[PDB]
Design a protein around this ligand. Structure first.
Ligand SMILES: *[C@@H]1O[C@H](CO)[C@@H](O[C@@H]2O[C@H](CO)[C@@H](O[C@@H]3O[C@H](CO)[C@@H](O)[C@H](O[C@H]4O[C@H](CO)[C@@H](O)[C@H](O)[C@@H]4O)[C@@H]3O)[C@H](O)[C@H]2NC(C)=O)[C@H](O)[C@H]1NC(C)=O
Ligand SMILES: *[C@@H]1O[C@H](CO)[C@@H](O[C@@H]2O[C@H](CO)[C@@H](O[C@@H]3O[C@H](CO)[C@@H](O)[C@H](O[C@H]4O[C@H](CO)[C@@H](O)[C@H](O)[C@@H]4O)[C@@H]3O)[C@H](O)[C@H]2NC(C)=O)[C@H](O)[C@H]1NC(C)=O
Ligand SMILES: CCCCCCCCO[C@@H]1O[C@H](CO)[C@@H](O)[C@H](O)[C@H]1O
Ligand SMILES: CCCCCCCCO[C@@H]1O[C@H](CO)[C@@H](O)[C@H](O)[C@H]1O
Ligand SMILES: *C(=O)CCCCCCCCCCCCCCC
Ligand SMILES: *C(=O)CCCCCCCCCCCCCCC
Lengths: 326, 326
């Protein structure tokens, strides 16, 4: 028996020595050295310092450039706000609590911080999904005589909110639950503990399917079709060298988008799966931190991929940074 | 009497309570809370995470692009290596010692770490100086029938090394000295203490003049003349719109370069001056950290200004990041 448990938590450490305390009450420095708690904080510092400017800039530059506000960009803006929730509801809090060596906000603080930290990265997730669907619709033109417009773009955004609530809201009401995780400075969904009172098991499956498999499939299909439609067109168009460039560009970019999605969600998926099927086994606090390290950083690399590498967004950004010129 | 002193150090705190320990021996958590030591470490993390890629990339991209290696770029490469010394000899060490709450490497560790941390930012300093001189020489053509070439560029680089040793080497031999500074996790020149055995006073003046005033003057003169020569040419050339752009660009860039130089060196200068003329007065550990916060970060913003905003370097960089294309 690998850890110690209580009404609202599970500490990944054995109380055989009597040292273990509530992660809501005293420091966890038996889980990890304090410098490791600092490093956790250092990381949380990095992600704020990078995540905030680049995501906030996105909103800001949109306000400055009329060229940018187009129904197809609505979802990208959604991404940037979602990333901000991640930045404030998650990274900063965790910067704060890590520096105490435990989650100082108690169980309600855990529900809140967990809800927003989940709501943030889930909106971001479904945004990447919705974007792919639209680009598929717009570029592949699967349904004839359909022009994508502002009203569709709204639903696409609202869809992310519904889907993200369909994930983050249930633990607040008793399907799974939020508990401190890893080094116990941050709160997340309990996918690793078979807590029957909240039916944690049925939820992790529902998560694995609806919030992982569905996204992975949609994202592959949609972009799959795209790299098809575009490679097709170029082969029928070879007298055009620009067109040849375009097909090249798009492919590369989709490879990046697809790889990026995996780097973000694979570890959380691989780990959740492994634990589910390895149930008798002991999983340390740091290791539990790893798939989180991966997903959290997406709040930096997503807008670099999806915004900064965008021709339109970058120029407006470069213009604004340089105070109106260039 | 504001602090406590010992053979190799000065702690900015009063031993009237008997709590003060050697910064080479035990934690300084009476100087500042531990979370503040973490934050110091977080900052040191930021500067490595940003400072290393962008400075190392510079060296690397030069290796990949023949277009870049030109005598006028030698000094820029010097800048990037100097910034690296700052990154490894300073930021990482300080990341390490901060996490102990004192300088764990003892006085010899203090001499080393101080020497390299000084040598780094001083090479960087004189690089910005040398660059300005060359650009003045090349653009203003003050001396007729002179073409700048590889051999001049070498001396320019070597000059930075001589000048930086003319600064960093004396404290190792008894003109001033290296002691832990601020929160006592890092070592620097002792400009704040009137330690007569090493003649700290005559050195801070020599520093203030030779390593601050001289740089400030040269940098203003040289770039002053440049924004003159270029504004002159455009006024005589107005039928050319490109030329009009150029004069605009250069001016803006010099404003940035000049402002940047001040942001880096003004606080260290203002503080050193104030302390010199305010000698009876007490200066806290954190405040002593401030002008260092400013100068250290230049290891990030200098190569952004001087390298990434360079048309030539950026493109090669953008090419290399994207794995040969675009
Ligand atoms: C991990 O292990 C440690 C050790 O098992 C455990 O800490 C212990 O918790 C109990 C509470 O359940 C503490 O017991 C108290 O001890 C003090 C005496 O110093 C008293 O204040 C308390 O007495 C009251 O309660 C007793 C019965 O529960 C009655 O006998 C008495 O009349 C009072 O009503 C009580 O004995 C105990 O001190 C700690 N021990 C240590 C070493 O901290 C901890 O709870 C575990 N962690 C987790 C995560 O569950
Ligand atoms: C800031 O203040 C504190 C308090 O003033 C100061 O720490 C003290 O340093 C002295 C050493 O100079 C320590 O004295 C030792 O105490 C222990 C007893 O616990 C003994 O090991 C030592 O005895 C030897 O030395 C004595 C004379 O120096 C002889 O009488 C004896 O025979 C032995 O030779 C010695 O007394 C003292 O314990 C600490 N006190 C505290 C509270 O830590 C500290 O040095 C100051 N910091 C700085 C930066 O200078
Ligand atoms: C940058 C934001 C910094 C926020 C405050 C960090 C405060 C850490 O606070 C410290 O936590 C310790 C337990 O670990 C307590 O014992 C100390 O009394 C408490 O001061
Ligand atoms: C990322 C690099 C982390 C390097 C190691 C940091 C080690 C901090 O180490 C700790 O310092 C304490 C005093 O402050 C000592 O009391 C502890 O015993 C020691 O483990
Ligand atoms: C060849 O095609 C290599 C191409 C792709 C490079 C894509 C880089 C995206 C980087 C996003 C930001 C990542 C780091 C975030 C750190 C917190
Ligand atoms: C109008 O001209 C505003 C123009 C200048 C912006 C120049 C920005 C340079 C930034 C360099 C890197 C700074 C941050 C380093 C953080 C560690």
């Amino acid at each position: 028996m690998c850890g110690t448990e209580g009404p609202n938590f599970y500490v990944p450490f054995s109380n055989k020595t009597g040292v273990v305390r509530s992660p809501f009450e005293a420091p966890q420095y038996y889980l990890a050295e304090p410098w490791q708690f600092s490093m956790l904080a250092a990381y949380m510092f990095l992600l704020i310092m990078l995540g905030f400017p680049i995501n906030f800039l996105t909103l800001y530059v949109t306000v400055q450039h009329k060229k940018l506000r187009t129904p197809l960009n609505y979802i990208l803006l959604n991404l940037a706000v979602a990333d901000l929730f991640m930045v404030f509801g998650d990274f900063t809090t965790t910067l704060y609590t890590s520096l105490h060596g435990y989650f100082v906000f108690g169980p309600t603080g855990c529900n809140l911080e967990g809800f927003f930290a989940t709501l943030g990265g889930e909106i971001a997730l479904w945004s990447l999904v919705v974007l792919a669907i639209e680009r598929y619709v717009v570029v592949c033109k699967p349904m004839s005589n359909f022009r994508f417009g502002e009203n569709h773009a709204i639903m696409g955004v609202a869809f992310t909110w519904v889907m993200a609530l369909a994930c983050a809201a249930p633990p607040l009401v008793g399907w799974s639950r939020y508990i401190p995780e890893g080094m116990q400075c941050s709160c997340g969904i309990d996918y690793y503990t078979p807590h029957e009172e909240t039916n944690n098991e049925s939820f992790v499956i529902y998560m694995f399917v609806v919030h992982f498999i569905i996204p992975l499939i949609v994202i592959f299909f949609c972009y799959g079709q795209l790299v098809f439609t575009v490679k097709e067109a170029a082969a029928q168009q070879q007298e055009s060298a620009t067109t040849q460039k375009a097909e090249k560009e798009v492919t590369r970019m989709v490879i990046i988008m697809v790889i990026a999605f995996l780097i973000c969600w694979l570890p959380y998926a691989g780990v959740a799966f492994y634990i589910f099927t390895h149930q008798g086994s002991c999983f340390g606090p740091i290791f539990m931190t790893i798939p989180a390290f991966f997903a959290k950083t997406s709040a930096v690399y997503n807008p670099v991929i999806y915004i900064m590498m965008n021709k339109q967004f970058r120029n407006c950004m470069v213009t604004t940074l340089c105070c109106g010129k260039n």
